[PDB]
């Protein structure tokens, strides 16, 4: 590997639109690729005033299927080298090199990626330069510390440098936690905002029900994505099939993401269900009395909160400074995370099933939208 | 396929062993040549320095069995099967081959990590040992090279990597600097007792230190692709943007040194030559030469290759990492705090310019003092 693809130039060129205009800057809309960040920036996005500003969306790593674009059937689909002064547009600009994109004089930019950041503040710079005007400000969605996506290695400084970035930016945190998180690490921003997460409203619908509960072990099992540590859940699973004798009389079931079933010992597996749709998943809540979800970043994720708030008893990581033991009764903390760690909770938990919640805010967003749109 | 299990803490099964006496075991990977990096041999250096008189000592390969070309390295060592249980007073195991094995731990048998998984494998070993003997709990001492978590991202590994330094029993951490310790303990880590060692110069190379330098127009680079951590990528993506934004870039050559690699086009015909891993006199002469350096380490602790650029009247762009900031050690060191490409262009930019001192760090040219302190606490 030579170069580092993440940072290909992303080339501008001049354009004629007189007026203001948000500029998303994803990396797909695709479904396939329609994970909770971008699925989240777009929620975001979609609450500025879209008579007061133009809005672009611009692909940075994924051309759209047929199929994708039906869930945005009032943006037009225009090429990187059309000009036109739509109100709502599209364009795919991961195939990128030797061509360009548009950008107008109060073209404003709305980053995701750490990547499409790195992008972005270089835009300014090029923009700054060609018009002869101050820098614009740029808007940071900031989903997760990015930088631990990845080893120490060029990724990683290039990801945290988008944070050195010392030219106006405004960063939109996912959380209070990341927020503060980023406070301590010591970076700096123009002005600092966060949303707070709030349960999916499917399953609030559902959080009322009688809860039938059986011996039901719940894993948010992602192979796929290392920040859910997946590996060192089966690891411990292992241990706690072993170790304990009433092991038989659970069941033990993965959610998340579609994996083989895995044998733990004693003929004992671990059966994948996959993405269950939100019906389902709400279901087997209800029944469920134990969970398993981990999160390797100081950002809270979805999961732990909503079996929580389903009476379940959830195994959860410590953080830095995310603990979310302090932010329902039901979640458990470990502050020591290994397989041993885990299955000895795994027990005491069981032998528990032989209330306080400090997050009201989770079950009742973008009200400082309306704020940020005021200072573009 | 599924990676299911986690490879790094395969069970390390241990049973009972006749030894009475007090034993030191190192835990290493490999002592392959070619795995002969420098986290190893400066463990096997420190290891070295305990009295030999005072402990039998036994090195535990952990991941890799040796060719009988790397055992001629140890050739006092009785190189020995786990299914044995010898009380010679030197020998190698190897222990990679690990599964339905044993190897025998002795009551007073002490070990000694390195890699964050042989510390995994090791306080695991002195719970069955406190339990299989009735015993308190043995010290472990820890040689930590580097904050290890960091040779992953977020994930099992990083966790696991990270646990090792949450372990709260008696644990003796031994720092590779300064730097490092004290990284370890704004994280808040705690340990029994805290001990680090200093970066020290080659020996080989300080007796080129005085030698005259006729300095040219050389800009040298350390180029290793396979170690992330010294951000090779990076470091040609600022090469590239060198050679493009310098009308003066042809004057000069650029080479690669630390890790054989292809011959990388930066543009204009300029080259990124590869030397590889040249011998420690060539690599002096080459420094006495050479005026401008790049040497990335996205580390907390202290690489050598920007100290020994810097000792030998380079200029050496390098990089800022938390509490470690070389531009303080050496006047010939500057420390970019934004770093990317472009800045990295730029600064290699005035400091061609600037072709037309002071150090701080004393220590690095005149080790293991505090060996002898340990060794009266096991
Ligand atoms: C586990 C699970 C979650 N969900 C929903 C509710 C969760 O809040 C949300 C979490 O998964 P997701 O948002 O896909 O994670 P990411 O954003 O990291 O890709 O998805 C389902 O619809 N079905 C399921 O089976
Ligand atoms: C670049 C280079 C370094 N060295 C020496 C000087 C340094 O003190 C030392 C550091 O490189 P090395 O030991 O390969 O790095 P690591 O310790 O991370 O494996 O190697 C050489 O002997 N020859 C060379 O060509």
């Known amino acids: 590997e030579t170069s580092i693809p993440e940072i290909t130039p992303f080339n501008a060129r001049t354009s004629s639109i007189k007026g203001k205009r948000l500029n998303l800057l994803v990396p797909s809309i695709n479904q396939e690729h329609m994970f909770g960040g971008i699925s989240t920036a777009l929620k975001l996005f979609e609450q500025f005033d879209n008579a007061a500003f133009a809005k672009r969306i611009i692909l940075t790593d994924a051309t759209p299927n047929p199929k994708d674009l039906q869930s945005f059937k009032s943006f037009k689909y225009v090429m990187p080298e059309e000009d036109k002064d739509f109100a709502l547009q599209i364009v795919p600009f991961n195939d990128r090199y030797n061509r360009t994109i548009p950008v107008a004089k109060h073209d404003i ?41 990845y080893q120490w290695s060029s990724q990683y400084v290039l990801a945290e440098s988008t944070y050195k970035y010392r030219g106006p930016q405004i960063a939109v945190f996912n959380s209070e936690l990341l927020k503060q998180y980023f406070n301590n690490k010591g970076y700096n921003f123009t002005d600092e905002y966060f949303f707070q997460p709030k349960i999916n409203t499917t399953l609030k619908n559902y959080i009322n029900d009688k809860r039938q509960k059986e011996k039901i072990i719940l894993v948010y099992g992602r192979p796929s994505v290392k920040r859910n540590a997946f590996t060192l859940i089966v690891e411990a699973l292992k241990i706690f099939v072993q170790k304990y004798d009433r092991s038989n009389e659970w069941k033990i079931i993965s959610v998340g993401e579609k994996h083989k079933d895995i044998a733990l010992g004693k003929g004992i597996h671990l059966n ?3 993405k269950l749709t939100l019906e389902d998943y709400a279901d087997l809540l209800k029944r469920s009395s134990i969970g398993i979800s981990l999160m390797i970043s100081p950002h809270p994720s979805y999961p732990p909160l909503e079996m929580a708030h389903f009476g379940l008893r959830v195994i959860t990581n410590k953080y830095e400074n995310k603990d979310l033991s302090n932010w329902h009764s039901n979640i458990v903390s470990l502050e020591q995370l290994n397989p041993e760690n885990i299955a ?33």
Not at 124 to 142: C, E, H, M, R
Not at 360 to 375: L, Q, V
């Open 109 to 149: 930019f709305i980053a995701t990626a750490w990547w499409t950041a790195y992008a972005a503040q270089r835009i300014v710079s090029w923009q700054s330069d060609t018009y002869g005007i101050p820098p614009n400000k740029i808007l940071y969605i900031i989903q997760d510390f990015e930088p631990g996506f």
């Open 272 to 274: 994948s269900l996959g």
């Open 344 to 376: 000895e909770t795994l027990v005491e938990l069981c032998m528990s099933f032989n209330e306080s919640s400090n997050m009201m805010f989770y079950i009742n967003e973008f009200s400082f939208i309306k704020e940020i749109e005021e200072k573009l």
